[PDB]
Amino acid sequence: ILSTASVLAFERKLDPSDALMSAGAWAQRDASQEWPAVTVREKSVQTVDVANLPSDADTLKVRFTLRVLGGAGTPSACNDAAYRDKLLQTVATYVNDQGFAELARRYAHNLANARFLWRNRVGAEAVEVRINHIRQGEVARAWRFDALAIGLRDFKADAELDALAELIASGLSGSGHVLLEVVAFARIGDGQEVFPSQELKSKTLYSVRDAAAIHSQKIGNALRTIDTWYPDEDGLGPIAVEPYGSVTSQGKAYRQPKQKLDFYTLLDNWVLRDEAPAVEQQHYVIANLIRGGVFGEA
Amino acid sequence: MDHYLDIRLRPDPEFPPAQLMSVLFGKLHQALVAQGGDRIGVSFPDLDESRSRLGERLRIHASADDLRALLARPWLEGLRDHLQFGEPAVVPHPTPYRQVSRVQAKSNPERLRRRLMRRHDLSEEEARKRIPDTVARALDLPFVTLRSQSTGQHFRLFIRHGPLQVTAEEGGFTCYGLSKGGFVPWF
């Protein structure tokens, strides 16, 4: 029969740390070690929470660590062992078809452009991303990208980029452990208001310990924005890899289930009836398996 | 004033287009502060008056050299992903002209009360009896929201397009692209 398992929990791959922010000056980012972090402040307008840079700063210092785990096709809790074996065979067949080539390149793009800087990148005239490869506590290999050249819409190539792509692909395959400290540097302006992820004093801004921060799941949703294989209209760029391709800004869901392009129909075509989809659709399927989920029937 | 440039906000899965309009308006305000001049117009081509919606495009009316200096200004960095634009082409000839105005409001009675402390030195109860709480103005016009480097408070800038006349009038433009007496073509 080979039905879908009743429980199909998948862990998140590419675990993001809780991204802080901090303030400082451009051309002092080489000495960006003891930079003072911005703080959530209550201001009476009714009182609301605001976060902004001080007077003697124009650059943000969003820092988070990303861990590439591997074993993307392996579920954490699968009800059926035959379905788990068939799905592992299908994911391994995908790996022999391509060894996490395009997915790691697009994830290296979402690292390379500061899409994790959601609203801290729109008003910035100079955005910079620094990625250190921490291995046994030391910087194995450093990278210093530029989000101005690497656009948020097109999907290009660059040599250090491909180096980051092979590193993320080796992490996703399982041939090693990849831990990347990513520090952003956006010239948002002198004392301009920044946008941390907001907690729910009508509205509060989330922090960790005397220092404002961005949520991990915001960084994860920014990293998942590789999906361009949806039936795109009206000139929309990449969307986040979600089940049934939904975006909150447009209020609509691409990859509609009335079409045969949502993630679950592509899974049941790929691993149950052996109807292998296109290369782009299986790229999207493996990206959704990388992000994790609670997949399964009821 | 003869040339126009249409900047259309490319849709974003992260932001509704109102914040893109606000960011573009602040960036063009900074560009107009840095450049100087008052022959630079601002319009809204798909301005629907049904729900006071701004639309999804923006129109800039200026000369050839002024628009060339505007594109040569580095204000456009960081906005190429969210916006797309053509070239500073000329406007069509049979185009009726309308004006654009910034209509502010006295939405805070307490601000005017604090003003009247600084002009007549009256008491708080004299301010409350002279100015009640019903003096707040509700304005049903399209608007963008902005913050300033000089004044850190977040302010709303209402934009209103005037009646469609038949000719243009010689007038200047503000740093926001709004008219202090100027006119822009409509097409």
Side-chain angles (χ1 to χ4, degrees), chain A residues 214-254:
Chain A
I214 319 178
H215 281 130
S216 293
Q217 78 270 5
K218 219 175 168 70
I219 315 300
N221 191 279
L223 255 63
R224 266 129 59 200
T225 314
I226 79 176
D227 198 6
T228 55
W229 319 291
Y230 67 103
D232 170 48
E233 289 159 354
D234 214 39
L236 197 73
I239 79 175
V241 176
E242 301 295 70
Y244 317 77
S246 65
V247 281
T248 51
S249 156
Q250 267 70 36
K252 75 164 292 313
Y254 304 88

Side-chain angles (χ1 to χ4, degrees), chain A residues 31-218:
Chain A
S32 59
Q33 273 73 59
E34 293 216 11
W35 270 16
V38 317
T39 49
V40 179
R41 316 298 319 137
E42 166 214 323
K43 193 168 54 55
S44 48
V45 305
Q46 194 63 39
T47 64
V48 289
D49 268 345
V50 69
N52 59 42
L53 262 59
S55 306
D56 38 0
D58 57 346
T59 312
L60 211 53
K61 175 88 187 308
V62 171
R63 184 201 161 300
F64 76 102
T65 70
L66 184 77
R67 309 180 312 130
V68 200
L69 301 190
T74 75
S76 71
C78 203
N79 203 309
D80 194 36
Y83 176 80
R84 173 202 169 100
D85 282 4
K86 178 59 173 297
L87 170 70
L88 276 186
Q89 176 205 321
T90 325
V91 170
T93 317
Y94 170 83
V95 169
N96 320 337
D97 293 342
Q98 62 276 79
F100 296 127
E102 179 90 349
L103 297 196
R105 192 187 60 104
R106 287 163 178 244
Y107 288 149
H109 272 180
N110 278 320
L111 259 76
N113 49 63
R115 201 175 320 261
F116 49 90
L117 259 53
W118 293 75
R119 282 224 63 183
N120 307 302
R121 209 214 162 274
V122 278
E125 47 185 352
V127 194
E128 180 202 35
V129 168
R130 299 189 170 175
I131 298 165
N132 302 359
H133 188 219
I134 309 181
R135 180 170 276 180
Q136 266 93 60
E138 300 312 307
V139 182
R141 167 69 190 279
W143 280 285
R144 200 165 305 190
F145 287 89
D146 166 53
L148 256 291
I150 304 155
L152 269 78
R153 310 265 175 173
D154 43 2
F155 274 138
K156 58 187 72 175
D158 183 28
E160 303 275 290
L161 212 135
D162 323 291
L164 194 65
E166 285 106 37
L167 188 61
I168 294 171
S170 83
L172 290 167
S173 313
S175 58
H177 212 60
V178 181
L179 166 75
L180 304 171
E181 168 178 354
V182 188
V183 181
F185 285 110
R187 197 194 282 250
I188 205 74
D190 281 323
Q192 305 268 33
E193 177 255 359
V194 287
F195 285 87
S197 59
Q198 305 170 14
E199 198 78 25
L200 71 148
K201 197 62 70 84
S202 61
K203 151 197 151 301
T204 174
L205 312 177
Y206 141 81
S207 65
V208 283
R209 30 186 75 182
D210 318 285
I214 319 178
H215 281 130
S216 293
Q217 78 270 5
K218 219 175 168 70

Side-chain angles (χ1 to χ4, degrees), chain B residues 117 119-121 123-125 127 131-136 138-146 148 150-165:
Chain B
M117 311 325 188
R119 290 176 61 85
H120 317 90
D121 303 16
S123 70
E124 170 188 0
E125 291 288 335
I131 297 191
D133 308 341
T134 185
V135 305
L139 264 58
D140 42 3
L141 325 159
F143 74 109
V144 313
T145 314
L146 324 146
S148 167
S150 295
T151 61
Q153 303 89 343
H154 285 56
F155 59 96
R156 293 189 168 198
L157 199 140
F158 295 86
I159 312 156
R160 193 52 253 187
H161 289 65
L164 252 197
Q165 300 185 348

Side-chain angles (χ1 to χ4, degrees), chain B residues 91-97 166 185-187:
Chain B
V91 301
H93 302 277
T95 45
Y97 288 87
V166 297
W186 178 254
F187 44 88

